[PDB]
Structure formats: structure tokens, C-alpha cells
Amino acid sequence: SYDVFLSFRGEDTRKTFVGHLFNALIEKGIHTFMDDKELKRGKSISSELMKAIGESRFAVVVFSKNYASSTWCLEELVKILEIHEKFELIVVPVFYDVDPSTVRKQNGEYAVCFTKFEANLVDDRDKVLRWREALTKVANISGHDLRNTYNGDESKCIQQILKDIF
Amino acid sequence: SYDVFLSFRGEDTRKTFVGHLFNALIEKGIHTFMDDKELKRGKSISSELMKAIGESRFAVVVFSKNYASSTWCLEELVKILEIHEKFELIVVPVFYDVDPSTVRKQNGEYAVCFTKFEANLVDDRDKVLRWREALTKVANISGHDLRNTYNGDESKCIQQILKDIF
Amino acid sequence: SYDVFLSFRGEDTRKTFVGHLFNALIEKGIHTFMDDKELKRGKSISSELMKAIGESRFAVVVFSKNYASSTWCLEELVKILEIHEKFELIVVPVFYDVDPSTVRKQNGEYAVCFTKFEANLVDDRDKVLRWREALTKVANISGHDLRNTYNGDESKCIQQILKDIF
Amino acid sequence: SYDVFLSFRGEDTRKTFVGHLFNALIEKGIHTFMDDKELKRGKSISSELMKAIGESRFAVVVFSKNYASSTWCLEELVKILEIHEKFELIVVPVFYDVDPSTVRKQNGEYAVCFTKFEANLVDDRDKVLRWREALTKVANISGHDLRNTYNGDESKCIQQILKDIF
């Protein structure tokens, strides 16, 4: 069924950028499963999300301001990275509206959220440290950085992604 | 005697929206002459633009918040309006993040930009008056809008326009 | 003999950029005549410069901080533009390390020089006004803007120039 | 078992110098693996870089003023030095706007950058000491310089290096 399941929080890019990527991939003929509900229930992953992650040939993750600001987003990133470790999922980082250098050091607005996420909720979980290590490891794999590689394009990055996919 | 044309403001559309619209139009099979690729080095700019506008059929101008700022864009709008007055060139409006009522009264950001040019070219050239009248008429002219019609997906609006051309 | 004679003041770009252009054009096989002497005698043009300008199939002008700061540079630009008007010289503006918008309005550091050039020397010549009008007319012809079209490349612009030439 | 390699600092060489050198090397017929095109999306970055360095023959690193700033670049220099210590990889220095004496003593801008990292990784990791020693040895190693050898044309230096490779 679904070939590559792009994963990004439906907060900012859900209107223009991620919408454009979904439309282009769907039109081009490659089957893909996306964010099922804008009102998605549960910060965890149900059967549908787990099955999509397991049965995805590859995955796409777009890092933005909110891309980790939700605990659901961090958990999904953790599951995806563990899939890449244990399964054959291809992970292609996409850096849109975010500085790759700051994300590498786990610094920026995400650092402010992590400090806010450094309360007793994660002190009873330590999942913030796991998420930060996972993000750092994921940043070790090169991807596409629209704000840097082209710095002024949006359709060119989509063309590159389509060239990689098909 | 060409197929279509495009018009946008480079400050806010040359990066994300206008490029996606151009890609959609090119893929759909209708030739488009944007002011980014339809320009040979040797030939002039104003002359080439006037010729391209004269030989094109359908024009779609996306009026942005700072649309009045670009004097060249205002002149292009005036020329397009004059061509539509003399000949019968296809007219189509595009308006994102700028409600038609705001532009029709030349108010808001348009009002501020005109006030900056209130003593510049309204009376010294009488072309600012013609541009204001043409903008008012084009605003009165019905087109495609997205502030409230779609309001949820820019790519949905692009596909709607592409399907609605013919 | 010489096919296209690139014209730029040997002040800043004579080390890296214009040197790269001269080396690439010479290597590619297109015959070209360049700035003969770094200690060029006379702010006017001798027989060699006039003959090169007349017998050039095309010309290349790179606009930078000093590209008009010398009276010799302005005179050469005037002669080149008059050649383009009366002869078949192809003029391709090149915008390197300069904002095209400011140059269009004849504003910027060049404006400071023009105000400094607005003394009795030009008051007895009025050649500053002629040079400003000539620059404005030349800016009406589109060319290549490395800081904008690519914004991060130097070899790509050279490749585009070579594609245009041969 | 490859032909050559390239090394540069993205802050000051990725735009003008390193690109011209890469174009010259590619045109000359010797394959080059820069850290801008020799990278597949799926595979890692550190692993791919280590493999490429191991399989390449000739490495040319242009030490810039802020060369010490890039920790990844320093690690790459350390790995290249270690490979040259164990194997016999071709070593070639490149130094522009940074006199060899300044880098040899790790002084000037190198001194300031190391002082910023004086309490960071000199004693906490003992790899800053190894990097300083390797930089000192490489500075003692003769290479190609342009501050006083050529001092008049960067492209002349690039052509000199390309001719001097073999």
C-alpha cells in the first residue's frame, strides 16, 4: 500500500509546504500515507500509524519550529529512528524554516521547549534526553536544506525529492 | 497569440507561491511566460514585457500586501488593463492575504503606499490616478480568492485555478 | 580578432572574479581583448580601445563599487552604450557585489561619488547627468545578477556566460 | 583507490574559491569528491566522509582565517593526518590570506579560536591537543601558498596548483 509516509506535525507546514509535497507525491503516482487527522487522537501511535511506519519503504521528516514541540512529534521521531536502526526505512532529513546547526546542537526555540519539557514529567521519563540524542543522531544523516542548498526555492526541492523517490 | 501569462510581486511570491503556480501550469500543458525565464539577455525589459503581454491571452496577477510598492508592477497592471480595454485579453484575479474589499478602496497597505506616493506621481504624472482607477476596476472584477473561499490549503487553490482555467 | 571585450575597472574584481572570467573565456577558445594595462595611461580611450570597441561582436560590463568611480570608467560606459545604440554590440549587464535597485536609481556609494563629481569639473561638462542617464538606460537591459539569481555561486554565472557566448 | 580530494571551510570558500578549484579539477580530467556533491541522502555523513578520505589519494585543504572554528573540519584534518601517518596519502597544503607562520604557531585567529576552546576540549578530550599538533606538523609541511608567492591573481594560483599536481 503506502510506500513512503512523510511525518511532520500538522502545525505550520500543513498549509503550504507539506501540502505541496503531499499533492506532488500523490499526483506523481507514488502511494503515500500522511497525517490522517488534523485532530489526531492520542499523543501515541495507534495500529494505523505503527503499521504505516513498519510497511513504509521510506520516510520524510520536515524539521520546523513545532516539529518537536509536541510530545507526539518526539515519540514519532523516536519510533522512526528505531525503525531505521532495526528495519530498512530510508530517512531523509528535510530542513525547512529551521537552522540545521542549531538543530544539531539541540538548541534554539526547541531548546526553550526542552527546558520547559525538563520538568518532572520528563524527570520521571528522561525521554527528553533520549529525544535529543535521537535528533542528534538523525542530523548525522544528510538530507535536503531548502533555506541553504537553494535558499530561495520551494519547487526545486520538491523536484529533487521526486527525483529521489521515482 | 500565446497561451497564458503570469504576474506576481517578487518580494513575497517569487519564492513559494508563484513558483508552484508556474510548475502547475507548465505540467498541465499550458505555456506560461513568467518574468523570470521569458527574457533573453540582449533584448530590453520594458519592450519585451510589453510584447509578451500583448501576445498573451490569460493573465493572473496575485495582488499582495505590498503590491502597490512595486512601481513596475503597477505599470504592468495598467498596461494589462489597457489591453483588456482595447482588446479582449482574458482577465483573471488572484488575491491571497489581501481581501478584495481592502484593495477595492485602495485602503490599508495600499492606502499607506499611495500616501507615500501621494505627492510623488498622483498629480505630477496623472498615471497614479490611472493606476488607482484600474486597480479599483480590477478589484470590482471578479476573480479567484483564497482568504475565505479556501482558507485552508494554498495548493488546493492552485489546483482549483488550474482546473478552472478550462 | 577580439570577439567580446569585457569592460570593468581594474580596481576590485581584477584579482578574482574578472580574472576568472578572462581565464575561462580565453581557455574556452573565444578570442577576447581585456584591460591592456593596470597602469592604463589617459582617462580617455586611445586607438586600441576604440578599435576594440568597434570590432567587438559583444561586450561584458561588471558593475561594482568602483565600476563608475573613475571618470575613465564612465567615459568607457558612455562609448559602449553609444556603440550599442549605433552599432550591433551586444551589452550584457553583470551585477556583482552591487545592488541592482540602487544602481537603477543612480543611488548608493556611486551617488556619493556623483555628489563629489557634482563640482565645477562636471558643472563645466554636465557629463555626470549624461552618465547617470546612460547607466539608467543600460539598466533597462536585463543581464546576470550573481548575488540574486543564484546568490551563492561564482562558477555557475561563468557557466551561464560561456553558454551564452559559444 | 580514488584520484583526488578537496577540503575547505564553508564560511569563506564554498562560494568563490573552492567552487572554481573544483571546476578546474573536473575539467582537467581528475575526479574530485567534494563535500557538496559526493553525498547520497540515505547514507551517513561521518561514515561516508571517512570512507571517501580513506579511498582518495591527494587532499588539498585551504586553511582560512576561521579554519579552527569548524570542529568538523578540524576532525577531518586530524583524520587526514592520521591516514597520512599510517598510509602514504598524497599531502598538499593550500593557504590563502593566512600566512604559514601564523598557523604554524597556532597564533592570531587560530590562537583566539583555541582560546575559546581552551577550557572546552584541550584537556576534557585530549583531541584538541592532537589537532593542534597535527596542524603544526601540516604547517611545517610545505605546500602551495598565495599570500606572497603569487599575491596578484587567485586564478593564477588555481592554475598553478592544477598544473603542479602532475
Coordinates of C-alpha atoms in Angstrom, one line a residue, chain C residues 13-160:
Chain C
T13 CA 37.3 42.5 -9.5
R14 CA 40.7 42.4 -11.3
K15 CA 42.0 39.8 -8.9
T16 CA 39.5 37.0 -8.5
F17 CA 36.2 37.5 -10.4
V18 CA 37.1 39.3 -13.6
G19 CA 40.3 37.3 -13.7
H20 CA 38.3 34.1 -13.5
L21 CA 36.1 35.3 -16.4
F22 CA 39.1 36.2 -18.5
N23 CA 40.8 32.9 -17.9
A24 CA 37.6 30.9 -18.6
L25 CA 36.9 32.8 -21.9
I26 CA 40.5 32.5 -23.1
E27 CA 40.6 28.8 -22.3
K28 CA 37.2 28.1 -24.0
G29 CA 38.6 29.4 -27.3
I30 CA 36.7 32.7 -27.7
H31 CA 39.1 35.5 -28.6
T32 CA 38.8 38.5 -26.3
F33 CA 40.7 41.7 -25.6
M34 CA 40.8 42.9 -22.0
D35 CA 42.2 45.6 -19.8
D36 CA 45.6 46.1 -21.5
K37 CA 47.5 47.8 -18.7
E38 CA 46.8 48.0 -15.0
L39 CA 48.6 51.4 -15.3
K40 CA 46.5 52.5 -18.2
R41 CA 47.5 55.9 -19.5
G42 CA 44.8 58.5 -20.0
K43 CA 41.3 58.6 -18.8
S44 CA 40.2 58.6 -22.4
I45 CA 40.4 55.8 -25.0
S46 CA 43.3 55.6 -27.4
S47 CA 43.3 53.9 -30.9
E48 CA 43.5 50.4 -29.4
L49 CA 40.4 50.9 -27.1
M50 CA 38.3 52.5 -29.9
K51 CA 39.2 49.8 -32.4
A52 CA 38.5 47.0 -29.9
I53 CA 35.1 48.6 -29.1
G54 CA 34.2 49.0 -32.7
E55 CA 35.3 45.5 -33.7
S56 CA 33.8 43.7 -30.8
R57 CA 30.9 41.3 -31.5
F58 CA 29.7 41.8 -28.0
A59 CA 30.8 43.3 -24.6
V60 CA 30.6 42.4 -20.9
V61 CA 30.3 45.0 -18.1
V62 CA 30.5 44.1 -14.5
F63 CA 29.1 46.8 -12.1
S64 CA 30.8 47.1 -8.7
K65 CA 31.7 49.8 -6.2
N66 CA 34.4 51.3 -8.5
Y67 CA 32.8 50.4 -11.8
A68 CA 31.9 54.1 -12.2
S69 CA 34.1 55.7 -9.6
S70 CA 36.6 56.6 -12.3
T71 CA 35.9 59.2 -15.0
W72 CA 37.6 56.8 -17.4
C73 CA 35.0 54.1 -16.4
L74 CA 32.1 56.5 -17.1
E75 CA 33.5 57.6 -20.4
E76 CA 34.0 54.0 -21.5
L77 CA 30.5 53.1 -20.5
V78 CA 29.2 56.1 -22.5
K79 CA 31.1 55.0 -25.6
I80 CA 29.9 51.4 -25.2
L81 CA 26.3 52.5 -24.8
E82 CA 26.6 54.7 -27.9
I83 CA 28.1 51.8 -29.7
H84 CA 25.1 49.6 -28.7
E85 CA 22.8 52.4 -30.0
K86 CA 24.5 53.0 -33.3
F87 CA 26.3 49.6 -33.9
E88 CA 25.4 46.0 -33.2
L89 CA 27.2 45.4 -29.9
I90 CA 25.5 43.1 -27.5
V91 CA 25.5 44.5 -24.0
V92 CA 25.0 42.1 -21.1
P93 CA 24.9 43.8 -17.7
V94 CA 26.6 41.8 -14.9
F95 CA 25.7 42.7 -11.3
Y96 CA 28.5 41.6 -9.0
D97 CA 28.9 43.0 -5.5
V98 CA 26.3 45.7 -6.1
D99 CA 22.5 46.1 -5.6
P100 CA 20.8 46.4 -9.0
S101 CA 18.0 48.5 -7.5
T102 CA 20.3 51.2 -6.2
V103 CA 22.3 51.3 -9.4
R104 CA 19.0 51.7 -11.3
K105 CA 18.2 54.9 -9.4
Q106 CA 21.8 56.0 -9.6
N107 CA 22.0 55.9 -5.8
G108 CA 24.4 54.4 -3.3
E109 CA 28.2 54.9 -2.9
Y110 CA 28.1 55.9 -6.6
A111 CA 25.7 58.6 -5.6
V112 CA 28.2 59.9 -3.0
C113 CA 30.9 59.9 -5.8
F114 CA 28.5 61.7 -8.1
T115 CA 27.8 64.4 -5.5
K116 CA 31.6 64.6 -5.2
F117 CA 31.6 64.6 -9.0
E118 CA 29.0 67.4 -9.0
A119 CA 31.7 70.0 -8.6
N120 CA 32.7 72.6 -11.2
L121 CA 34.5 70.0 -13.2
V122 CA 31.2 68.4 -14.3
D123 CA 29.4 71.8 -14.0
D124 CA 31.6 72.8 -16.9
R125 CA 30.8 69.4 -18.6
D126 CA 27.3 68.2 -17.3
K127 CA 28.8 64.7 -18.1
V128 CA 27.6 63.4 -14.8
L129 CA 23.9 63.8 -15.9
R130 CA 24.7 62.1 -19.2
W131 CA 26.5 59.2 -17.4
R132 CA 23.6 58.8 -15.0
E133 CA 21.0 58.7 -17.8
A134 CA 23.3 56.2 -19.7
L135 CA 23.5 54.0 -16.7
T136 CA 19.7 54.1 -16.2
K137 CA 19.2 53.2 -19.8
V138 CA 21.7 50.4 -19.6
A139 CA 19.9 49.0 -16.6
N140 CA 16.8 48.7 -18.7
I141 CA 18.5 45.7 -20.4
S142 CA 18.4 42.5 -18.4
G143 CA 21.6 40.6 -17.7
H144 CA 23.0 38.3 -15.0
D145 CA 22.9 39.1 -11.2
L146 CA 25.0 36.6 -9.3
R147 CA 24.1 37.9 -5.9
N148 CA 20.4 37.5 -6.7
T149 CA 19.8 34.8 -9.4
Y150 CA 22.0 32.3 -7.6
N151 CA 23.0 34.4 -4.6
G152 CA 25.7 31.9 -3.6
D153 CA 27.6 30.9 -6.7
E154 CA 30.5 32.2 -8.8
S155 CA 31.2 29.3 -11.2
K156 CA 27.6 29.0 -12.2
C157 CA 27.5 32.5 -13.5
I158 CA 30.6 31.8 -15.5
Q159 CA 29.0 28.7 -16.9
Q160 CA 25.9 30.8 -17.9

